[PDB]
Motif scaffolding. Structure first.
Motif, PDB file in Angstrom:
ATOM      1  N   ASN A 272      24.308  31.597  65.730  1.00 38.41           N
ATOM      2  CA  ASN A 272      24.117  31.055  67.069  1.00 38.41           C
ATOM      3  C   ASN A 272      23.041  29.977  67.165  1.00 38.41           C
ATOM      4  O   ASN A 272      23.062  29.163  68.089  1.00 38.41           O
ATOM      5  N   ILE A 273      22.096  29.964  66.230  1.00 38.88           N
ATOM      6  CA  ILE A 273      21.016  28.982  66.293  1.00 38.88           C
ATOM      7  C   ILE A 273      21.404  27.652  65.653  1.00 38.88           C
ATOM      8  O   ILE A 273      20.643  26.684  65.702  1.00 38.88           O
ATOM      9  N   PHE A 274      22.589  27.603  65.052  1.00 40.52           N
ATOM     10  CA  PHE A 274      23.088  26.365  64.460  1.00 40.52           C
ATOM     11  C   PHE A 274      24.128  25.726  65.365  1.00 40.52           C
ATOM     12  O   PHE A 274      24.990  26.407  65.915  1.00 40.52           O
ATOM     13  N   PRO A 275      24.048  24.401  65.540  1.00 35.56           N
ATOM     14  CA  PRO A 275      24.938  23.657  66.439  1.00 35.56           C
ATOM     15  C   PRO A 275      26.310  23.368  65.841  1.00 35.56           C
ATOM     16  O   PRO A 275      26.481  23.358  64.622  1.00 35.56           O
ATOM     17  N   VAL A 276      27.281  23.116  66.711  1.00 34.53           N
ATOM     18  CA  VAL A 276      28.587  22.627  66.292  1.00 34.53           C
ATOM     19  C   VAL A 276      28.534  21.113  66.110  1.00 34.53           C
ATOM     20  O   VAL A 276      27.842  20.416  66.851  1.00 34.53           O
ATOM     21  N   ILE A 277      29.265  20.608  65.127  1.00 35.26           N
ATOM     22  CA  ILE A 277      29.392  19.171  64.943  1.00 35.26           C
ATOM     23  C   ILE A 277      30.791  18.747  65.372  1.00 35.26           C
ATOM     24  O   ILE A 277      31.777  19.303  64.903  1.00 35.26           O
ATOM     25  N   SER A 278      30.874  17.768  66.268  1.00 34.33           N
ATOM     26  CA  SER A 278      32.168  17.220  66.651  1.00 34.33           C
ATOM     27  C   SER A 278      32.358  15.838  66.055  1.00 34.33           C
ATOM     28  O   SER A 278      31.548  14.938  66.279  1.00 34.33           O
ATOM     29  N   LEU A 279      33.431  15.673  65.291  1.00 36.41           N
ATOM     30  CA  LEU A 279      33.800  14.361  64.774  1.00 36.41           C
ATOM     31  C   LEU A 279      35.016  13.874  65.542  1.00 36.41           C
ATOM     32  O   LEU A 279      36.067  14.511  65.514  1.00 36.41           O
ATOM     33  N   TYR A 280      34.871  12.755  66.241  1.00 35.53           N
ATOM     34  CA  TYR A 280      35.991  12.188  66.980  1.00 35.53           C
ATOM     35  C   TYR A 280      36.673  11.156  66.099  1.00 35.53           C
ATOM     36  O   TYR A 280      36.033  10.223  65.619  1.00 35.53           O
ATOM     37  N   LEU A 281      37.973  11.336  65.882  1.00 41.47           N
ATOM     38  CA  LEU A 281      38.734  10.449  65.011  1.00 41.47           C
ATOM     39  C   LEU A 281      39.598   9.520  65.848  1.00 41.47           C
ATOM     40  O   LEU A 281      40.111   9.913  66.896  1.00 41.47           O
TER      41      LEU A 281
END
Ligand SMILES: CCCN1CCC[C@@]12CCN([C@@H](C)C(=O)N[C@@H](Cc1ccccc1)[C@H](O)CNCc1cccc(C(C)C)c1)C2=O
Length: 380
Positions: A272-281
């Motif tokens: 929970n303390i680590f963020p999600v990474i979003s890559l927009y293609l």
């Protein structure tokens, strides 16, 4: 049939995913790493301390020496060998045999991996990056030319947390391997599987860089690279954001350099303390995009060393690159990825072995629209 090809991969992100192949007549069975990030088919062809078996050309009555040598340096690791052609099949792939170029590896440096259980590499990308040059026809090109197999393949790579390692479906799309929508991004140029990233967010926060920076000097989809690799400027911003989000915990010197392990008591990893990474293609329509979202369960790669097994230990699976973005195996894991060569596009969908916990899930979502009309491609 597709069902007969399901679960034909073994391995893991850290040492590679491999498929069984045969070379020669009579057929010699070898395990071969599936690599969308290169374009040479090459097999160990002489003894090596890490090789369990190797290709014996003298025992194949269908082998032809091309009387040419070949040298291939990757980002890390290199090999040299002799080029030839021979008959090749994939026992749990299409029911065909084709004659293909094969590099017989006779010398290597930091290429073969001890205990990996593969003896060769199958470069599935395009001729432009083949060595010695683009006149050496890659395997998949030979497959399509010599058979009626449709010009596409798809990969479902599955992690340890979610034996079978995944599926390579040649010639089509297997709907039982994904859920939801399949979203396509254009292949910018047929050399690597080059794509364009138009936006990056870390825990919903835009990195707010000129989008060309995300693709300096190219972005590729690469099953033969373990990590997400990012251009220096982007890597620094990403590490800063992930550090800030996870700042309630103190990490070892060298963890963020991808070298050192972090370990937690069994089952207590603080996802929970680590963020999600979003890559927009980049999407198929002007200024539309879709995003794939990457959880820490992906970019914190578990190590399976017996010696460390009392706890749950991980390496940071994001690395700095000087040769552009690489969406490697930890990114592909949990997604069904369709390499649609015929239509020059790559598709992403949530795979049947997708990554999630009770609060968050890897996702493929779209469409998103952007106002700025800048071409995010670094090259024309
Ligand atoms: C299975 C993963 C094993 N893992 C675990 C240790 C790190 C490594 C080995 C090398 N590597 C990357 C950095 C790499 O160079 N992959 C190679 C494949 C490979 C090398 C060595 C051992 C196993 C697999 C890939 O092809 C790169 N594509 C872009 C690229 C970069 C530079 C040159 C080329 C040409 C060959 C076209 C492609 C990894 O991620």
């Amino acid at each position: 049939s597709f069902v007969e090809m399901v679960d034909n991969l073994r391995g893991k992100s850290g040492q590679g995913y491999y498929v069984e192949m045969t070379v020669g007549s009579p057929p010699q069975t070898l395990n071969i790493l599936v690599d969308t990030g290169s374009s040479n088919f090459a097999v160990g062809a002489a003894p090596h301390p890490f090789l369990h078996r190797y290709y014996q050309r003298q025992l194949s009555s269908t082998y032809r020496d091309l009387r040419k040598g070949v040298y291939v340096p990757y980002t890390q690791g290199k090999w040299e060998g002799e080029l030839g052609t021979d008959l090749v099949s994939i026992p749990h792939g299409p029911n065909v045999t084709v004659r293909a170029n094969i590099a017989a590896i006779t010398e290597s440096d930091k290429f073969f991996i001890n205990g990996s259980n593969w003896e060769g590499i199958l470069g599935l990308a395009y001729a432009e990056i083949a060595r010695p040059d683009d006149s050496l026809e890659p395997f998949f090109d030979s497959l399509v030319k010599q058979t009626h197999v449709p010009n596409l393949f798809s990969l479902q790579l599955c992690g340890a947390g979610f034996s079978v390692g995944g599926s390579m479906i040649i010639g089509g799309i297997d709907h039982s391997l994904y859920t939801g929508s399949l979203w396509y991004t254009p292949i910018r140029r047929e050399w690597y599987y080059e794509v364009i990233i138009v936006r990056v967010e870390i825990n919903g926060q835009d990195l707010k860089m000129d989008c060309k920076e995300y693709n300096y000097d190219k972005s590729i989809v690469d099953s033969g690279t373990t990590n997400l690799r990012l251009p220096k400027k982007v890597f620094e911003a990403a590490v800063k954001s992930i550090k800030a989000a996870s700042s309630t915990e103190k990490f070892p010197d060298g963890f963020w350099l991808g070298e050192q392990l972090v370990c937690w008591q069994a089952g207590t990893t603080p996802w929970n303390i680590f963020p999600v990474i979003s890559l927009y293609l980049m999407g198929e329509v002007t200024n539309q995009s879709f995003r794939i979202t990457i959880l820490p369960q992906q970019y914190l790669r578990p190590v399976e060393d017996v010696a460390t097994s009392q706890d749950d230990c991980y390496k940071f699976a994001i690395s700095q690159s000087s040769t552009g973005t690489v969406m490697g195996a930890v990114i592909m894991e949990g997604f069904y990825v369709v390499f649609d060569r015929a239509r020059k596009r790559i598709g992403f969908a949530v795979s049947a072995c997708h990554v999630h916990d009770e609060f968050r899930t890897a996702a493929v979502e779209g469409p998103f629209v952007t106002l700025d009309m800048e071409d995010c491609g670094y090259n024309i």
